[PDB]
């Protein structure tokens, strides 16, 4: 068996959702911000936000909504986790003591159902009579909000329309009514139903179905003064309400897909819209009152306000202040002014909240030379693209290098006192026949520049037609100074060439240190690329000079230096190259038993290969034979997102289902087959999507540091900005920390009353297993924050093992010291 420890070094930073309301008091204006597994509660002031409380939940927050049922003084909070843990929460404050009440809770998962493409949707009735959930195709689940439903029991209503895009409860209806956009072979439609709690079925809805734009994406529930709904698409915005129909199709919105909506004026006169390029729009609803006294909707208008960060959620707060919740970039507070500034913008940034964004890649390098270690991460996407240099100081110090284009991979080259960064920027087919970039960015603002003239694929004779307005990715290699972080050089790769891998190393008997990049020819027609290049560059005297090129018949997904040789993965093949005295790469040996070799890692002569669906293989190079040999494979099927080698026998992997596992050689040499079976001895549900695993420690490393119980250091980056550290334990230390978890779980009160053991259970759509071989470091580190009565309750009847004293009782002061040493790792 294996024993390992996981700790959350930096908490998730990306904003996954955000709401406003009156949650802490019926009087205050609240802003609740949801980051993965984290809920942040703020109170709105005239200058900004006053933080009041933060809680963690044992689950990914999927639905977050505030409502106020008749009889309550203040808003209640509904949250549903991605594992279908539902709960209703209340804020309660006793002077200085702030706690969160679990008013109702339960798990709403169905035994049989197909998870929907557009994900979990959760909505609540304007009269707060019920909670609507769209969890599975063809089914609508209703949790009625009666006082007695403390377990959140629910029923399903058969829904004929299998493929639903979005749904909202409507305002102004005689009965609870849902309005939704759905897709069938004939296109997309908008349709209504009435929900009867008494009959437990749908009844005919208030207004007829209408055919809508093919890419109709979002439903906006218009308030009572107008009623009805607005449907947002790629090209058009339409209003529907019985006999009334409006459509505005302003050319400005066609340019970028609109992804987020919020209401500015409670009556619905003004709404806010944002798009993937970061533009913020004001949607205006023009009113017309008839002599009857009835208010109708006259027309719709769209006005461009300015630019914000690409935002997952918008929420207007008060006065001119809007909170911009960003997942791909830093989140923001911005003020909307009535008068434009001299550039034509009505939007002026107030505050900027650090979001490590998607961490596509990262490297740990001791830039200071202090032995501490700094983490430079490839963070953000598109305009929000950034390099983030992170050091420990008690908070983490983070520096931001704006790139305005997406970063893909990073590697450090000490000989050149610089980093290499792979980037992709978006250009659009323009009337010249070429392409034009939407904004300047790192690859265009380099001091010196170069464009590849390779003729390897120049024979072509393969047609790829271009239509005006289509997007293309232009991938580049950035040479960036390690002190100034100035783009010294940018090399533009070939048209339709995407950069997938990058390494810096010396090869063979060649004393020069090179940047080596692996690329693939990407054509929309091909599901899998069949052409690729391996390129050797040298960065010298401010210029990047190409040394050699190798044509491969596929995509160079990953590369890694192997004892003076270049190890590369091309599609289904793993190939090792030698570097000749003629400065040209030469094929040596190949391995083909992989469906798609996405990730590579080396230790000694051992190679860990990550397949798309076949988990990991322990390959080895036998020098005497000059060929590869399969040592062992994990036959259990998994989808890999990142792998890492812990030691010669333990191997760590990340699953696309937000899961982590550790494989070990069975080490029983009785049969050859036993050695060949990698047994999964560790299972854990991280809750984050790990993209990169990197050996190193951010915390200061000194020869004098008290040797911690933990051994080894692997840092991992995730899509939501979370950075974590994995380390190993001795059998004795694991059992102690494991036994303590079980004691802590009985003592610590969970938000929503979610069982910790369930949360960490390995979970795919098909399987759920109890966690094994892993210590939730965060749970262990929470011992220091529980009250003294609880601490002593935890240590009761707790015995140590395999130590100086075989059985040794624990006291509350003893464990406080142990955990405090465990907090020094991060």
């Amino acid at each position: 068996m294996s024993y390992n420890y996981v700790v959350t070094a930096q908490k998730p930073t990306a904003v996954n959702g955000c709401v406003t309301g009156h949650f802490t008091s019926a009087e205050d204006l609240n802003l609740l911000i949801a980051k993965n597994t984290r809920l942040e509660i703020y109170v709105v002031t005239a200058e900004g936000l006053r933080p009041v409380k933060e809680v963690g939940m044992y689950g990914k927050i999927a639905v977050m909504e505030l409502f106020r049922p008749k009889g309550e003084s203040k808003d209640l909070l509904f949250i549903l986790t991605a594992k279908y843990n539902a709960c209703i929460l209340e804020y309660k404050q006793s002077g200085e003591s702030i706690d969160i009440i679990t008013r109702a809770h339960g798990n709403v998962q169905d035994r049989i159902g197909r998870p929907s493409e557009t994900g979990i949707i959760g909505i609540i009735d304007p009269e707060c009579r019920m909670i609507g959930l769209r969890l599975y195709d063809g089914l609508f689940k209703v949790i009625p909000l009666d006082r007695d439903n403390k377990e959140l029991k629910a029923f399903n209503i058969r829904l004929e329309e299998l493929h639903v895009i979005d749904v909202k409860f409507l305002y102004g209806c005689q009965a609870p009514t849902i309005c939704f956009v759905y897709q069938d072979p004939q296109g997309r439609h908008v349709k209504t139903y009435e929900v009867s709690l008494r009959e437990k079925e749908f009844n005919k809805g208030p207004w007829k179905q209408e055919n809508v734009e093919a890419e109709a994406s979002m439903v906006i529930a218009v308030p009572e003064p107008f009623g009805g709904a607005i449907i947002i698409g790629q090209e058009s915005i339409t209003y529907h309400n019985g006999d009334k129909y409006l459509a505005i199709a302003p050319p400005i919105i066609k340019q970028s897909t609109i992804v987020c909506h919020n209401r500015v004026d409670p009556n619905g006169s003004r709404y806010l819209l944002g798009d993937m390029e970061g533009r913020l729009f004001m949607l205006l609803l023009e009113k017309e009152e008839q002599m009857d006294g009835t208010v109708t909707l006259k027309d719709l208008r769209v006005e461009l306000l300015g630019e914000t960060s690409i935002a997952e959620c918008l929420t207007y707060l008060d006065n001119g202040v809007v909170f911009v919740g960003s997942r791909l970039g830093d989140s923001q507070l911005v003020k909307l002014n009535v008068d434009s500034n001299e550039q034509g913008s009505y939007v002026v940034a107030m505050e900027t909240f650090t979001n490590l964004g998607p961490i596509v890649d990262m490297c740990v390098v001791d830039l200071e030379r202090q032995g501490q270690g700094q983490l430079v991460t490839c963070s953000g996407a598109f305009k929000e693209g950034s390099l983030r240099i992170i050091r420990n100081g008690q908070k983490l110090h983070i520096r931001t290098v704006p790139l305005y284009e997406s970063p893909r991979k990073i590697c450090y080259q000490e000989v050149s006192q610089c980093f290499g960064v792979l980037s992709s920027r978006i250009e659009v087919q323009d009337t010249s026949g070429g392409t034009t970039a939407l904004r300047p960015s790192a690859s265009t603002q380099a001091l010196s520049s170069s464009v590849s003239s390779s003729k390897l694929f120049s024979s072509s004779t393969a047609p790829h037609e271009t239509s005006f307005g289509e997007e293309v990715e232009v991938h580049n290699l950035l040479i960036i100074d390690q002190h100034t972080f100035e783009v010294l050089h940018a090399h533009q790769f070939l048209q339709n060439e995407y950069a997938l891998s990058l390494v810096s190393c010396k090869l063979g008997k060649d004393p020069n240190t090179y940047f080596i990049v692996g690329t693939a020819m990407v054509y929309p027609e091909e599901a899998e690329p069949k052409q690729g290049r391996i390129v050797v560059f040298q960065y010298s005297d401010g210029k990047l000079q190409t040394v050699a090129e190798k044509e491969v018949k596929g995509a160079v997904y990953s590369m890694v230096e192997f004892n003076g040789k270049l190890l590369a993965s091309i599609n289904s093949t793993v190939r090792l190259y030698e570097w000749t005295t003629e400065k040209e790469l030469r094929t040596e040996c190949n391995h083909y038993n992989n469906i798609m070799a996405l990730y590579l890692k080396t230790k000694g002569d051992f190679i860990l290969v990550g397949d798309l669906m076949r988990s990991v293989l322990l390959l080895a190079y036998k020098p005497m034979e000059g060929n590869f040999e399969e040592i062992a494979r994990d036959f259990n099927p998994n989808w890999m997102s990142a792998v890492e080698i812990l030691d010669d026998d333990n191997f760590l992997g990340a699953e696309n289902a937000f899961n982590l596992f550790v494989c070990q050689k069975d080490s029983a040499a009785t049969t050859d087959e036993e050695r060949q079976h990698l047994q999964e001895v560790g299972l854990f549900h991280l809750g984050e999507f790990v993209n990169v695993f990197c050996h190193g420690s951010l915390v200061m490393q000194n020869l004098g540091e008290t040797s911690t119980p933990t051994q080894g250091s692997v840092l991992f980056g995730t899509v939501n900005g979370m950075i974590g550290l994995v380390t190993s334990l001795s059998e004795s230390w694991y059992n102690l920390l494991l036994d303590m978890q079980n004691r802590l779980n009985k003592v610590i009160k969970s938000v929503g009353k979610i069982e910790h053991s369930f949360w960490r259970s390995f979970h795919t759509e098909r399987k759920t297993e109890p966690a094994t071989g892993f210590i939730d470091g965060d749970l262990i580190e929470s011992f220091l924050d529980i009250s003294r009565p609880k601490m002593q309750e935890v240590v009761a009847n707790l015995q140590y093992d395999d130590g100086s004293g075989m059985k040794r009782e624990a006291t509350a002061d003893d464990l406080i010291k142990v955990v405090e040493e465990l907090t020094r790792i991060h």
Binding site: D110, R111, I112, G113, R114, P115, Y136, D137, G138, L139, R158, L162, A527, E528, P529, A555, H591, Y592, N593, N594, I595, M596, L598, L612, M613, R614, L617, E630, R633, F635, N636, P637, N638, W639, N656, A657, E673, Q676, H677, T764, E765, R766, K767
Partner: protein, 325 residues
């Protein structure tokens, strides 16, 4: 000649890697040095010498040389390790079974969640499976081990059944005691849960229905760690075993012993309301408690869902692609 199996040496194949560990022996992927065709070789070990050649491999050889169908895997030949020269008693070399190589297996494709099945994809998958099962059931062979892992699919979209190690012939006139509880718990029929031991071909049909539902939900229908719990899960959806729906349920050994919590009513049509009507009817008949009332393979092929499916169009599934990565 092509028919002289067991003489050719495994030297004629270059091993690429071990695709999977078969329960009876490991399975490796290799290339025929002469033709370049990828084939799969299953290692049969005579070293144990407890029972000599494993009977599981014996059954696969006996049966698959008889069965010819597009939806049944083809054993091409049997090859051997370099045998000891003129000393058969010292020889302990193993025998390897030549088969057609398969790009993917259904269990792996589902677990990676990398495949999205349309109705039309399922139609082509199910039609091939039933036609194969019908061929085998017409030849009076019972697979007895229908599982997601055992279904094999080439990227083209063709499906072939493969693990016949537990298969045996069925005599309608003289039903005899067979290996009890052969199928894996997730895909096991209720009759075996109750230990019929004299089961009909309908046992394989039950499993294929479990697959049918699983293709639509992308999750196995009945997942349990205990035989009783599986009966409970089945009972909730398909209804509790009761004499009215299963007149002969009382004759089954464990009927009084193994009981669901309640006498649940059938809810299959309600819980699978999202499944198309043509398919839902197939599921209701395939997942029928009484083996005598359970549909046959031919009846599934003559269903509105599958009768008008044309095998010319094999509808390849959304296969793993680099954009997906």
């Amino acid at each position: 000649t092509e028919s002289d199996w067991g003489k050719r040496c495994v030297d004629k194949f270059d091993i690429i890697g071990i695709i999977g560990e078969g329960t009876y022996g490991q399975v490796y992927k290799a290339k025929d040095k002469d033709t370049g065709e990828l084939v799969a070789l299953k290692k049969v070990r005579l070293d144990n010498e407890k029972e000599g050649f494993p009977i599981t491999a014996i059954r696969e050889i006996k049966i698959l040389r008889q069965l010819i169908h597009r939806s049944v895997v083809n054993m091409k030949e049997i090859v051997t390790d370099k045998q000891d020269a003129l000393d058969f008693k010292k020889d302990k070399g193993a025998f390897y079974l030549v088969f057609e190589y398969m790009d993917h297996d259904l269990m792996g494709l589902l677990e990676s969640g990398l495949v999205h099945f349309s109705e039309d994809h399922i139609k082509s998958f199910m039609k091939q499976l039933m036609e194969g099962l019908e061929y085998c059931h017409k030849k009076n062979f019972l697979h007895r081990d229908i599982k997601c892992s055992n279904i094999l699919l080439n990227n083209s979209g063709q499906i072939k059944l493969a693990d016949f190690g537990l298969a045996r012939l069925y005599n309608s006139e003289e039903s005899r005691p067979y290996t009890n509880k052969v199928i894996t718990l997730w895909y096991r029929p209720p009759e075996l849960l109750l230990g019929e031991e004299r089961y009909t071909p309908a046992i394989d049909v039950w499993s294929c229905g479990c697959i049918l539902g699983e293709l639509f939900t992308k999750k196995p229908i009945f997942q349990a760690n205990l035989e009783l719990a599986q009966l409970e899960l089945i009972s909730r959806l398909c209804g509790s075993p009761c004499p009215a729906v299963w007149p002969d349920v009382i004759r089954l050994p464990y009927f009084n012993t193994m009981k669901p919590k309640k006498q649940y009513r059938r809810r299959l049509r309600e819980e699978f309301s999202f499944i198309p009507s043509a398919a839902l009817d197939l599921l209701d008949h395939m997942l029928t408690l009484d083996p005598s009332k359970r549909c046959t393979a031919e009846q599934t092929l003559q269903s509105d869902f599958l009768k008008d499916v044309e095998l010319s169009k094999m509808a390849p599934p959304d296969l793993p692609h680099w954009q997906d990565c």
